[PDB]
RNA sequence: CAGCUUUACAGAUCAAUGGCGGAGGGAGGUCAACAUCAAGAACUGUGGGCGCCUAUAGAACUUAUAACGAACAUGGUUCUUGCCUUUUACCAGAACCAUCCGGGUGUUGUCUCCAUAGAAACAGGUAAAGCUGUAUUUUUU
């Protein structure tokens, strides 16, 4: 166990379309975007970031009631212990997102 | 009856709402759902006791953790 | 929107075969597609109606003549129907 | 950069040598000079020629040829 | 061979389905997706040629077919 | 509406294939939504050239292939 | 406004067949009993390949300025301090732990107040609900 914390599992938060199909994507150039959000402190990038998180996954363990409800936000792309008490984003915790256009 | 139009009736009662059966859960008194005006009468009597302070910054090296 | 074009330029990147009204098929990369089917390929093997394959770097197509375009089995998996 | 529109406009202003190939059409050419222009690729084409393909020159007048036909032109 | 009597084509979307064409050749397969310009999508195409004798075969798989490039269409078998 | 992408194939040489196994050599000088090649003439399939400066029609285009990289 | 699909009608032949059937209540309760709620961010089942790995269904509740409670006590043990000096009783910090006031769901059951139907579609029509529809270069003139 952890406090500085991840998943550190095999079942990770099931996505709605399939991880398969994203590597698959992946083997070619032109079609991989690499976006890393960028903006001021309390821009909302994390915020934001987690929006698309959870728009791709199915269920996510860390996505509780509240969150869901919308009252806290789904600050799902501070994984480190600090990053959370500490309400700021400090590290790049970005993610790998099969997107729609 | 005009800016407390609509608490006035029932603000003071033992249990407020003992029917009143879509605002509350039932007798049991579990849950309760109001609607919108009824809160903000509710809101606009509480001015004495309410928390009043919406900036949350304002408790800067005053939280739990800063004490 | 034409949920088949839509799976045609979804398709873009992958070795995608093509035969035209002529009969003459094609196999290589996919680079672009558009609403009429405007393709473009890379590292294109060009089979002529009788079998004569000419291998060449690139080629433009027009949607008129494009009969059908065979896509991999990726394209089964996700996410343009649900 | 020049769009067929343009092309065509300085085919339309010039009136020099055209020779047109014709769709669905092997057998013959015509060779004449632009000298109209619609919308829709229908040009009428004076002083036009019908030319059989080198596998002579035969009769042909002034000419409004529906352009929905047309392969080449080359003023 | 057996189809319910269906109104449309979308209503028996992911049914075997024989699919002629215009240059002889018939393509045989399961229908993902049809269009307004009956552009169709078949899961599991296979191309079956007429050749100038005996029927001509060969699998495709995952195909887009072109609309204008197409006969009509017949239901070969259901789904699963 | 949707402007086909010949701008990578901008002042470059190119093997159109055009109706009836027909080919046409030639630098690019133009085009529009239909596709009609406006193109510098160059020769025609032993090989022979006809005209200066050509338009193709979209219609009798079957294909263009890259002839320079 | 047209097409299709759904419902309330009137009578239908009632075949065709479906499906709602070997159709059987709801709302509550200061009412119980049972399960269960601090854990590699964390749960459970199912198959399969050898206690485990591997695909599959699922997952209420409680949470990320971390917690069932937007709330707040008490008791014990030790360790440290203070008042003191003899103990209770205590001061207020620590680490451990417990008790207690409460809470959540989920499932059963009861108690209450209301109830209380064993058959409706098809051919259409009537009316209402869910989608689509209103040639001159790449789809169909
Ligand atoms: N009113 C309002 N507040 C927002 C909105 N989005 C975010 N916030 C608030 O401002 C903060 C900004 O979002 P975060 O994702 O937490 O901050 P961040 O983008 O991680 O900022 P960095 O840590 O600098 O990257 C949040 O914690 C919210 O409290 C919004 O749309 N409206
Ligand atoms: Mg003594």
């Given at each position: 166990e952890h406090t500085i914390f991840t998943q550190l599992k095999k079942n990770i938060p099931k996505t709605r379309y399939n991880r398969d199909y994203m590597l698959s994507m992946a083997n070619?150039?032109?079609?991989?975007?690499?976006?890393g959000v960028i903006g001021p402190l309390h821009s909302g990038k994390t915020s934001l970031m987690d929006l698309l998180v959870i728009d791709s996954?199915?269920?996510?363990?860390?996505?509780?009631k509240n969150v869901e409800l919308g009252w806290?936000?789904?600050?799902?792309?501070?994984?480190?212990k600090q990053e959370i008490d500490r309400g700021l984003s400090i590290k790049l915790n970005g993610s790998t997102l099969l997107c729609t256009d | 009856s005009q800016d407390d139009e609509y608490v006035k009736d029932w603000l003071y009662d033992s249990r407020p709402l003992e029917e009143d059966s879509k605002k509350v859960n039932?007798?049991?008194?579990?849950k309760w759902s109001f609607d919108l005006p009824e809160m903000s009468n509710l809101y606009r009597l509480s001015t004495?006791?309410?928390?009043?302070?919406?900036?949350?910054?304002?408790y800067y090296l005053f939280d739990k953790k800063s004490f | 929107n034409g949920i088949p074009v839509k799976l045609l330029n979804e398709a873009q990147g992958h070795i995608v075969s093509l035969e035209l009204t002529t009969g003459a098929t094609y196999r290589g990369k996919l680079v672009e597609s558009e609403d009429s089917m405007n393709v473009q390929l890379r590292d294109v093997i060009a089979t002529e109606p009788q079998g004569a394959v000419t291998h060449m770097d690139q080629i433009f197509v027009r949607g008129?003549?494009?009969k059908f375009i065979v896509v991999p089995d990726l394209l089964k998996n996700a996410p343009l129907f649900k | 950069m020049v769009p067929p529109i343009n092309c065509i406009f300085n085919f339309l202003q010039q009136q020099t040598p055209v020779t047109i190939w014709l769709f669905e059409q092997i057998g013959i050419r015509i060779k004449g000079k632009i000298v109209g222009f619609d919308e829709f690729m229908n040009v009428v084409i004076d002083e036009a020629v019908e030319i059989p393909v080198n596998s002579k020159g035969t009769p042909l007048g002034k000419i409004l040829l529906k352009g929905d036909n047309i392969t080449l032109i080359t003023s | 061979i057996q189809v319910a009597?269906?109104?449309?084509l979308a209503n028996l979307i992911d049914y075997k389905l024989r699919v002629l064409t215009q240059d002889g050749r018939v393509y045989i397969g399961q229908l993902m997706a049809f269009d307004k310009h009956m552009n169709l999508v078949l899961n599991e195409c296979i191309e079956e040629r007429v050749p100038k004798i005996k029927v001509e075969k060969r699998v495709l798989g995952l195909t887009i077919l072109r609309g204008e490039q197409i006969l009509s269409t017949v239901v070969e078998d259901k789904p699963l | 509406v949707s402007t086909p992408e010949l701008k990578k194939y901008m002042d470059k040489k190119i093997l159109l294939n055009i109706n009836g196994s027909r080919k046409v050599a030639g630098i690019l000088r133009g085009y529009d939504i239909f596709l009609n090649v406006v193109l510098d003439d160059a020769m025609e399939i032993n090989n022979h050239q006809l005209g200066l400066q050509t338009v193709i029609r979209g219609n009798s285009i079957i294909s263009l292939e890259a002839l320079d990289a």
């Open positions: 070619i150039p032109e079609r991989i975007i690499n976006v996954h199915k269920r996510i363990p860390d996505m509780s806290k936000p789904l600050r799902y792309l501070d994984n480190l | 039932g007798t049991s008194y579990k004495p006791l309410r928390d009043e302070v919406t900036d949350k910054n304002y | 008129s003549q494009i | - | 009597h269906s109104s449309r | -």
